[PDB]
Amino acid sequence: DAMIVIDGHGIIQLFSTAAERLFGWSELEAIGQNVNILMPEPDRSRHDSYISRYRTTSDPHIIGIGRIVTGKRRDGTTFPMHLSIGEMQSGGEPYFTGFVRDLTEHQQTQARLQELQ
Numbered sequence: 001d002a003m004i005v006i007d008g009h010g011i012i013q014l015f016s017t018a019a020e021r022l023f024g025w026s027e028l029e030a031i032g033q034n035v036n037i038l039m040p041e042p043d044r045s046r047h048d049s050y051i052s053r054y055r056t057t058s059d060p061h062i063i064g065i066g067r068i069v070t071g072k073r074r075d076g077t078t079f080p081m082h083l084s085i086g087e088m089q090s091g092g093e094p095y096f097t098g099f100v101r102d103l104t105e106h107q108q109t110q111a112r113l114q115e116l117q
């Protein structure tokens with residue numbers, strides 16, 4: 001699916017091809033940007049505190065659990081996606097890997113089945 005790797009400050013280190021297709025940002029444009037550029041407010045402005053909080057408490061809210069959330073594309077459209085987060089270490093510092101599964105199709109079918117009674 002789409003895969004993204006960020007350092008402990010939420011900065012995008014790696015951005016896969018599939019992620020480019022999904023979020024609308026090329027790898028070059030993405031790397032160097034905070035991961036918060038991939039979601040809408042209120043998560044966006046709160047994203048750093050989510051990471052800081054985790055690093056301070058070591059009490060996960062998504063790592064090892066998963067969560068369906070709303071991501072944001074370059075053109076500004078929002079969409080539902082399942083997010084899985086793995087934690088890694090490299091060069092003495094933490095890195096996090098996010099696996100994104102686009103759930104738009106699932107949401108759409110579900111809504112269509114509901115509107116037709």
Ligand code: HEM
Pocket residue numbers: 004005006035038039043050051054059060061062063069070071072083085096097098099
């Ligand atoms: C792009 C859509 C995304 C949204 C909507 C989102 C949202 C969130 C939310 C709501 C939390 C937990 C806050 C709480 O419950 O207190 C969180 C935690 C975090 N997010 Fe994101 N996130 C996104 C993508 C990512 C990606 C791509 C990564 C990794 C590449 C990532 C890394 C983290 C980390 C490391 C934490 C803390 C982990 C934990 O609490 O267990 N996020 N995010």
